[PDB]
Write a protein that binds this ligand. Structure first.
Ligand SMILES: N#Cc1cc2[nH]c(=O)c(=O)[nH]c2cc1[N+](=O)[O-]
Lengths: 50, 52
C-alpha cells in the first residue's frame, strides 16, 4: 500500500494521516506531529426530557 | 498578569472575588487541581496549540 509505495523509491512525501507508531519509525522518518488521535467511543442518543 | 503560578492559583483562591478564569499549560493546571479535597476547580473546553 501507501507505505510500500513510499519505500519502493518513486514517492517522496506521504501527506496524509499516518498514525505514528513505535516500530513504524525505522524504515521511514517522521516530523513533529500536528494533531492528536485516539480511539474514542460514541453511544446512541441518550438526551430525553423530564 | 500574575507573577507566579502558585501566586496565580492563590489569587484565584480568594473565593469568589478577583479572577474568574486562567490560561496555562494543561500539565500544571491539572496537578494544581489534583490536590484539593473540595475540588473547587475544574478543567473544561477543547485543547489547542500543541507544545512539547
Ligand atoms: N481518520 C482516520 C484514520 C486514519 C488512520 N491512519 C492510519 O495511519 C491507520 O493505520 N488507520 C487509520 C484509520 C482511520 N480511520 O478510518 O478512522
Amino acid at each position: 500500500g501507501m507505505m510500500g509505495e513510499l519505500l519502493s523509491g518513486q514517492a517522496d512525501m506521504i501527506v496524509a494521516p499516518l498514525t505514528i507508531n513505535n516500530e513504524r519509525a525505522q524504515y521511514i522518518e517522521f516530523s513533529k506531529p500536528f494533531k492528536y488521535q485516539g480511539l474514542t467511543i460514541l453511544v446512541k442518543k441518550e438526551i430525553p426530557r423530564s | 498578569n500574575v507573577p507566579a503560578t502558585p501566586d496565580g492559583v492563590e489569587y484565584l483562591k480568594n473565593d469568589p472575588e478577583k479572577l474568574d478564569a486562567f490560561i496555562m499549560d494543561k500539565a500544571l493546571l491539572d496537578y494544581e487541581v489534583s490536590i484539593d479535597a473540595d475540588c473547587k476547580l475544574l478543567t473544561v473546553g477543547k485543547p489547542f496549540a500543541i507544545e512539547g
